[PDB]
C-alpha cells in the first residue's frame, strides 16, 4: 500500500489543509447536557459526530441521510470513528517559534541564521531588537540593538531602518535570507580558511543550508503561524463513574493556547500599549512551548494537581511513549497467564493447559465448532452453551485444540527460548504444567513463577509455531551449539545413582544374557542396582552411511548401566553408559546422539532419560539429614593453630617490626591457608571415606553421602557450598572491599553467633542489592545491541569473497584458554587449508567445518585456520550464509532470511546477569580509555623536535613519502621506544590500553574485530559463560557501518560527509564501469548507541533513543524512510523482512522495481 514514510516541515498552508475547521473557543462540554460546544476543542462540525450516523441536533438519525451536513447545527452525519482522524487548527495572532527548532542544541533557527541562541532568545522574549535588512548604511542585518540603541537610532533614522522584536523578527530574518547565496559565500569561506573549529562550524552550517535548500522546506516554517489541533478522540474528555470526568492534559494545554491567543486578538483590537501586547505575546509563546514540549522553558506548567502537564512531545518520547509502549510492544487478545507446575509425565512437545483457561482462550473456535456441528443454531446460543459449560462444550474443546499449539512465555524473555510452542493437553486445574526439560531454557523454577499463554490464530501462525517454535525444534542453544534440554537435577541424581558401582553389591560377579536380564534381576531384588557384573550387550555402529553393523560382546559393567542401556538408541556406543553419568556426561551423551542420529531420536532419548532419572531418583531414597554434613575432626586443631599464628604475628606487630597493614595482610594470608586446609580435610573426609570390605580385609570406594553425591553428580551444589555447610565459611569482606581480619569460623551445621551473622548479612544484602541493580544495565545493553543489529539478515547464499580471519587457539601464559576446535566448528573456510608441511589440500576452500573436519584438523594438528567472518562479507544490505556458518540452533548451515543480528544481540545479552559487564559495555560503546596508547601513526624513523611546554613534538619520517604528521606527545607519558629509532605502522610508542578507533585506523578491520572479540570473550570466559564469536562479530560489523570520504574524486560525495559504507561500496562498484573513481574512504567505528542512532531509517532511530533530536533532524533534512528493517515493519504492522516474511518482502521488491 505504502512504500516509505516521508517526514518534513509543515507549512501554514499544509496545516490548514489537514484542518477541518478552526477551533475558535476553549469550551469543551456544556456541563448540563454534556454534548460538545459549537466551536470548541470538542466540536461536532469541526471534528465529527459523537454518535454513529446521528446528527448532534437531532434532525437526522438514520444511515439513509449519510453524506449530508445539517442546517440547524451544521454537523456532518457520518461514523464516530472519524473523531480520531479529523484535525483542527488555531490561527495564531502572533507568530510563535517551534520549540523543537529553537531549543534543539544545536538550534536549527540559530545555526541557520548564524545567530547565537542567546541572542535569539533575547529577541524572542521581547528583551532586545534585531535589525532586519534595516538599511545598508549604519546597522548590519544581523545586528541586535537594545531599548537604548533602538531609541537612539529612532530619531537618528526613520526610514531604511527595520528592527523588530519577538518571533515576528526571527521569522522576517528567516524569510529574507536566501539559501543558495549564503551557501555559496560559506563555501568560499570554507575553501579559503584554515582552522579546524571554524572549518567544522562552516561544514555544519553548510550541511544545514544544503539539506534545507534541497528539500522543499522553507526556513520560515520553523515559526508557527498556524497551530494544528489533535483529534478529540486522541485527547478524550470521558466521564468517570459518579459524575466525574477524566480528561487529557492536551485539553488543558490547548485551552491555555486558545485563551491567550484570543486575549491577544482582543488586546490588538483595543490598541493596547506595547507593554501589555508584548506581555501577552510572551505568554502565548510560553503556552505554545508548553503544549509542544512543556520543557525547554525553565519551568513546566503543572495542572490542577502539582504535577507537570504531559505535553505533545512527552507522548512520543521515552520508555512510556507511543513508540515503546504501544508500537514495539502491545497488550494482546487470546492470551492468558497462570502459575506453572511441573507435570513430569509430559512429553517434550506438550504442556498442561487448564480447561477453564483453554475454554476462555479458544472461545471463537468453540463457537465455530458448535455452529458447524449443528449443536447451536446461532452464535448467541453457542455463547450460552459455553457459559453453561454443557457436557458437549468440553468435547468440542477437545476437538478444537487437538493439534493447535500455544506459545508459552516467561516474564523476562532474555533470548529466543523464552517463548516456545507446545501442544496443549487439557488438565483439570488452574496451573500450567511445564515439561521439566524446558525450565532451564525458561530459567523457570516452581516456587511461584508465572507464564503467559498465547494462541496462534491463523494457519501461518500455527505452522510457524509447529515448525519454528516447537519445544522439540529447540534443543540446542542458539548462542553456543550446546544442548539446552539437558536434564537438570533430579534426573541427573537418578542417573548418577543408577550408574555408579559399589564394591560388594548383592549379585556381584554373575554373568547376564542382556539388559532385560539385568532389569529383571534388579526389579526382583536378586541383584543390587549397581553390582559389578558381566552382560552380553549389542552395540550398533554406523561407520559408513545408513548401515548399522551390530557388535555383540560381554561387557564388564553394572546392573544399573545395563538397565540404562535399554533407553539408549541404536547407533550409539556402549561406552557412553559405562561411566558414573554425572551432569556433564548426560549432556555430552545427548549431544552425541544429536550429532550422530538426528533430532527425532534425540527428543525421544531426552524424554526417556528424564523418565528413567526421575524413577530411579525416587527409588534411591536420596535425602538430606544433619549427619550428612560431616565436619572434619581436624577443624578444631586447624582453627587453633591459625589462631596461635595470629597471636604470634600480633605480638610481632606489637614489637615494632611490621606496620599494621602488613600484619593485617599476613593474617589474611594465614587465615586463607587455614580455610583451604579445612576445606581440603572436609572434602577428603566426605568424598571417599566410606570404607567397606568385599570378601576380604577392606577396600575403598567413593562416598554415598547424599550431599556429596548431589555435589559430585552436578545435580545441585558445589564445593564452595559444601564447604560453607561443613567447614568454615571463609573470610567475609565488608561491602567496601576490606576483608574482615576475623573470619567466620563457624559453618552452618553448627550455628553462627550473632557477630558472625551480622557480618554475613553485610554481604548478603550487598549481593541482593547488586543483583537488583545489575539486570537494569544488562537489559539496557541488550536493548542497545538489539537496536544496532535489528536490521541484519542473511540475504544471500554466497557473497564470493575470499577475505576472512585467521582463527588460532587462544593461549595466555603458556596455557590454552579455548582450543581451536571450539572456535572453528561450523565456520566456512575462506582459503584452502593445507597441512603444515604443505603436502596436499587437507580440506577444500569453501567447506563448512562440521565436527568431522574439526576432528581431522585436531588429528593433523593444524594451529591456524582461515575462516569466513560476517565482518568481512561483501553482501550489500545483509550477509551471505557462507560467511555466517552453522546456525548453532540447528546443525545445518544458516538459512536465507535468518535474523542473525537479533540472535547475536540476545546471545550476548542474556548471560549479562551472570557477570565485568561494564567492561563489555565499554567495548561495545567503543569508549576511549582515559590514558590511551600513543601508537605509531606512520612507518618511518622517529625523531624529536620542540620539547618546550607545548609538549614534545615527535616526527616519524617515511623512507620516501612525505612526513608532515607530527604528534604532540606529553612528557609525563613514558616513551616505549627511543628517540632515534624506526617504527612500523600501527606500532606502540607510549604505553597504555589501545583505543579501538586507533586499532581500526592503523592495523585494520580484522585487527579491531579480533581485539573486540578477544576482550569480550575474555570477560565471558572468566565468568564461565560460553558465547560463539559469530555474534560478537555481527555486533562489530554493525559498529563498522559508516565511512568518511577522504577524497571524493569523481564520486558524488563531499569530503567530510560520513556516508553509509554500503552506499560508497556500490558507488565504487558502479564507477568501475567508468574510468574515473577517485573515491577513497576511511572506515569509521561507532559505539552501538552511536551506530544505531546514526542509521538510514529515522523511525528506527527515533523509536529507541532520543526522539526529539532524531525527529527534528529528519524533519529539517526531509528524510524519507523506506522501511527495509525489522523495527520499521514491526511498527507499521507488516511482515518483517526476516523470517517467513522475507520471501514476501522479496516479492514486493519484484513488483516495486518494475
Amino acid at each position: 500500500e505504502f512504500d516509505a514514510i516521508k517526514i518534513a516541515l509543515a507549512s501554514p498552508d499544509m496545516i490548514r489543509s489537514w484542518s477541518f475547521g478552526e477551533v475558535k473557543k476553549p469550551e469543551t462540554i456544556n456541563y448540563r447536557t454534556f454534548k460538545p460546544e459549537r466551536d470548541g476543542l470538542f466540536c461536532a462540525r469541526i471534528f465529527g459526530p459523537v454518535k454513529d450516523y446521528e446528527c448532534l441536533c437531532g434532525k437526522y438519525k438514520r444511515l439513509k441521510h449519510r453524506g449530508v451536513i445539517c442546517e440547524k447545527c451544521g454537523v456532518e452525519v457520518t461514523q464516530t470513528k472519524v473523531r480520531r482522524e479529523r484535525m483542527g487548527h488555531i490561527e495564531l495572532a502572533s507568530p510563535t517559534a517551534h520549540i523543537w527548532f529553537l531549543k534543539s542544541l544545536p538550534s536549527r533557527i540559530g545555526l541557520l541564521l548564524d545567530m547565537p541562541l542567546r541572542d535569539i532568545e533575547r529577541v524572542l522574549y521581547f528583551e532586545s531588537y534585531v535589525v532586519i535588512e534595516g538599511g545598508m548604511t549604519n546597522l548590519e542585518r544581523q545586528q541586535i540593538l537594545t531599548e537604548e540603541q533602538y531609541l537612539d537610532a529612532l530619531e537618528e533614522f526613520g526610514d531604511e531602518f527595520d528592527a523588530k522584536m519577538g518571533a515576528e523578527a526571527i521569522q522576517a530574518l528567516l524569510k529574507s535570507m536566501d539559501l543558495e547565496q549564503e551557501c555559496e559565500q560559506l563555501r568560499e569561506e570554507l575553501n579559503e580558511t584554515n582552522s579546524e573549529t571554524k572549518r567544522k562550524k562552516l561544514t555544519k552550517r553548510i550541511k544545514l543550508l544544503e539539506a534545507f535548500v534541497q528539500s522543499g522546506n522553507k526556513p520560515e516554517w520553523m515559526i508557527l503561524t498556524v497551530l494544528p489541533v489533535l483529534p478529540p478522540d486522541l485527547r478524550p474528555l470521558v466521564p468517570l463513574d459518579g459524575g466525574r470526568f477524566a480528561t487529557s492534559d492536551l485539553n488543558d494545554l490547548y485551552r491555555r493556547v486558545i485563551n491567550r491567543n484570543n486575549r491577544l486578538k482582543r488586546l490588538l483590537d483595543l490598541a493596547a500599549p506595547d507593554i501589555i501586547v508584548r506581555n501577552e505575546k510572551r505568554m502565548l509563546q510560553e503556552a505554545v512551548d508548553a503544549l509542544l514540549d512543556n520543557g525547554r522553558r525553565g519551568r513546566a506548567i503543572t495542572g490542577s494537581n502539582k504535577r507537570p502537564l504531559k505535553s505533545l512531545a512527552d507522548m512520543i518520547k521515552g520508555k512510556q511513549g507511543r513508540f515503546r509502549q504501544n508500537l514495539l510492544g502491545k497488550r494482546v487478545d487470546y492470551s492468558g497467564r497462570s502459575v506453572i507446575t511441573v507435570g513430569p509425565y509430559l512429553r517434550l512437545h506438550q504442556c498442561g493447559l487448564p480447561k477453564k483457561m483453554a475454554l476462555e482462550l479458544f472461545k471463537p473456535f468453540i463457537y465455530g465448532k458448535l455452529e458447524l456441528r449443528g449443536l447451536a443454531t446461532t452464535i448467541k446460543a453457542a455463547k450460552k452453551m459455553v457459559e453453561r459449560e454443557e457436557a458437549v462444550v468440553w468435547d468440542i474443546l477437545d476437538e478444537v485444540i487437538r493439534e493447535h499449539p500455544v506459545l508459552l512465555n516467561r516474564a523476562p524473555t532474555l533470548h529466543r527460548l523464552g517463548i516456545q510452542a507446545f501442544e496443549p493437553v487439557l488438565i483439570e486445574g488452574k496451573a500450567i504444567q511445564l515439561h521439566p526439560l524446558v525450565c532451564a531454557a525458561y530459567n523457570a523454577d516452581f516456587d511461584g513463577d508465572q507464564m503467559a499463554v498465547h494462541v496462534p490464530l491463523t494457519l501461518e501462525a500455527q505452522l510457524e509455531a509447529r515448525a519454528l517454535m516447537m519445544s522439540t525444534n529447540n534443543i540446542l542453544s542458539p548462542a553456543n551449539g550446546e544442548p539446552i534440554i539437558v536434564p537438570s537435577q533430579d534426573v541427573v541424581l537418578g542417573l548418577y545413582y543408577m550408574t555408579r558401582d559399589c564394591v560388594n553389591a548383592k549379585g556381584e560377579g554373575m554373568v547376564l544374557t542382556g539388559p532385560k536380564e539385568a532389569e529383571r534381576l534388579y526389579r526382583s531384588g536378586l541383584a543390587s542396582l549397581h553390582a559389578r557384573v558381566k552382560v552380553r550387550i549389542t552395540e550398533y555402529e554406523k561407520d559408513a552411511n545408513g548401515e548399522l553393523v551390530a557388535k555383540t560382546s560381554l561387557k564388564d559393567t553394572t546392573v544399573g548401566r545395563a538397565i540404562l542401556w535399554m533407553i539408549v538408541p541404536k547407533g550409539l556406543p556402549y561406552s557412553i553408559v559405562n561411566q558414573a553419568l554425572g551432569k556433564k556426561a548426560i549432556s555430552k551423551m545427548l549431544n552425541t546422539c544429536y550429532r550422530i542420529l538426528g533430532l527425532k531420536p534425540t527428543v525421544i532419548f531426552a524424554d526417556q532419560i528424564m523418565y528413567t532419572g526421575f524413577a530411579y531418583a525416587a527409588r534411591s531414597g536420596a535425602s538430606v539429614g544433619i549427619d550428612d554434613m560431616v565436619i572434619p575432626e581436624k577443624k578444631h586443631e586447624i582453627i587453633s593453630e591459625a589462631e596461635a599464628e595470629v597471636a604470634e604475628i600480633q605480638e610481632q606487630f606489637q614489637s615494632g617490626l611490621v606496620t599494621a597493614g602488613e600484619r593485617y595482610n599476613k593474617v589474611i594470608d594465614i587465615w586463607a591457608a587455614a580455610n583451604d586446609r579445612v576445606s581440603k580435610a572436609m572434602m577428603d573426609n566426605l568424598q571417599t571415606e566410606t570404607v567397606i570390605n568385599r570378601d576380604g580385609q577392606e577396600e575403598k570406594q567413593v562416598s554415598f553421602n547424599s550431599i556429596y553425591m548431589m555435589a559430585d553428580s552436578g545435580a545441585r551444589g558445589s564445593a564452595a557450598q559444601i564447604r560453607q555447610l561443613a567447614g568454615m565459611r571463609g573470610l567475609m569482606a565488608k561491602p567496601d572491599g576490606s576483608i574482615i581480619e576475623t573470619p567466620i569460623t563457624a559453618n552452618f551445621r553448627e550455628g553462627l553467633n550473632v557477630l558472625q551473622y551480622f557480618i554475613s548479612t553485610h554481604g548478603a544484602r550487598k549481593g541482593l542489592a547488586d543483583t537488583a541493580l545489575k539486570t537494569a544495565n544488562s537489559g539496557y545493553l541488550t536493548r542497545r545491541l538489539v537496536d544496532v543489529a535489528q536490521d541484519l539478515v542473511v540475504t544471500e547464499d554466497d557473497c564470493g569473497t575470499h577475505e576472512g580471519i585467521m582463527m588460532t587457539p587462544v593461549i595466555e601464559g603458556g596455557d590454552v584458554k579455548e582450543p581451536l576446535r571450539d572456535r572453528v566448528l561450523g565456520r566456512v573456510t575462506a582459503e584452502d587449508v593445507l597441512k603444515p608441511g604443505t603436502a596436499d589440500i587437507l580440506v577444500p576452500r569453501n567447506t563448512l567445518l562440521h565436527e568431522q573436519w574439526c576432528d581431522l584438523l585436531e588429528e593433523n594438528s593444524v594451529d591456524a585456520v582461515k575462516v569466513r567472518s560476517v565482518v568481512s562479507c561483501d553482501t550489500d544490505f545483509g550477509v551471505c550464509a557462507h560467511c555466517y556458518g552453522r546456525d548453532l540452533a540447528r546443525g545445518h548451515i544458516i538459512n536465507k532470511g535468518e535474523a542473525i543480528g537479533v540472535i547475536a544481540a540476545q546471545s550476548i545479552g542474556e548471560p549479562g546477569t551472570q557477570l565485568g559487564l561494564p567492561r563489555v559495555a565499554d567495548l561495545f560503546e567503543a569508549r576511549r580509555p582515559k590514558e590511551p596508547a600513543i601508537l605509531a601513526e606512520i612507518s618511518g624513523i622517529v625523531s624529536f623536535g620542540k620539547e618546550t611546554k607545548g609538549k614534545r613534538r615527535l616526527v616519524i619520517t617515511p623512507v620516501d613519502g612525505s612526513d608532515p604528521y607530527e604528534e604532540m606527545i606529553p612528557k609525563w607519558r613514558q616513551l616505549n621506544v627511543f628517540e632515534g629509532e624506526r617504527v612500523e605502522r600501527g606500532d606502540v610508542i607510549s604505553d597504555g590500553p589501545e583505543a579501538p578507533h586507533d586499532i581500526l585506523r592503523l592495523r585494520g578491520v580484522h585487527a579491531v574485530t579480533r581485539y573486540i572479540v578477544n576482550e569480550v570473550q575474555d570477560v565471558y570466559r572468566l565468568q564461565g559463560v560460553k558465547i560463539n564469536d559469530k555474534h560478537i562479530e555481527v555486533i562489530v560489523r554493525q559498529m563498522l557501518r559508516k565511512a568518511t570520504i577522504v577524497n571524493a574524486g569523481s564520486s558524488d560525495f563531499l569530503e567530510g560527509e560520513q556516508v553509509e559504507y554500503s552506499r560508497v561500496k556500490i558507488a565504487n562498484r558502479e564507477l568501475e564501469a567508468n574510468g574515473k573513481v577517485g573515491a577513497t574512504y576511511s572506515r569509521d567505528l561507532l559505539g552501538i548507541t552511536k551506530a544505531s542512532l546514526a542509521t538510514e531509517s529515522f523511525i528506527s532511530a527515533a523509536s529507541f533513543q532520543e526522539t526529539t533530536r532524531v525527529l527534528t533532524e529528519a524533519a529539517v533534512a526531509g528524510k524519507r524512510d523506506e522501511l527495509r528493517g525489522l523495527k520499521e515493519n514491526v511498527i507499521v504492522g507488516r511482515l518483517i523482512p526476516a523470517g517467513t516474511g522475507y520471501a514476501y518482502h522479496q516479492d514486493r521488491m519484484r513488483r516495486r522495481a518494475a
Binding site: 550473632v754 557477630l755 551480622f758 548479612t761 553485610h762
Partner: protein, 198 residues
Amino acid sequence: SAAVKEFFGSSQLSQFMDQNNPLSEITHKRRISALGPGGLTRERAGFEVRDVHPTHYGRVCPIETPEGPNIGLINSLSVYAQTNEYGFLETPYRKVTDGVVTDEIHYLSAIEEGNYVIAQANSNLDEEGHFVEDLVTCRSKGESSLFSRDQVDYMDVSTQQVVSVGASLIPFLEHDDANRALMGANMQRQAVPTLRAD
C-alpha cells in the same frame, strides 16, 4: 482539614495496613522507611544508604527488608530498639561493673555505643555476674575483638536483640543463610490464616 486529610489519606508514609496476619500487622506498624516526603527515592537512593551499617546492630534488623527496587530502604525496627527524645534509635545494654554484670539497663544511642566496649550476649557468667572466660568478645568501634574481663562497660541484654520480631520467629536462624532468612521473614509475613490455627 485538607492538610490533615492529605497527610493521613494520600501520602507515601501512610499505607493500607497489611492485615493477612498478626505478624504482618505488627511488623507493618513498626516499619522504618527512608522514603516519603523528606527522604530519598527508590529510583536514585544509592547503594551506600541501602547497605547494612555496624550501627544498625540492635536498632534496625539486618535481614527483615524487602528484596527488590527498595531494598535497605524499608528497614524494620529491632525487638528491643527504642527512640530518644530527639528521635535517634537506642538499644538496651546491661551495665558491667569491674567484673560483675549488673541487671541495670541503659539504653545507648548509636553515637554513644562507640565510646564503650560492649560484650556479646553469647558470653558466660559464673552464677554471680562474673564472666567465666578472662577474654570476652566485644565490639568497640565498628570492629570486634577480644578484651580482658576488667575492660567491658556493657553487655548485650539478650541474644534476640539484633533481629526484628519476624526474624526472631525463625527457629534455627543461625543455621540459615542470610539471603534465605531474609526470604523466610518476608514470606511468613504473607501466611494466610487457615481454618484452624494449629
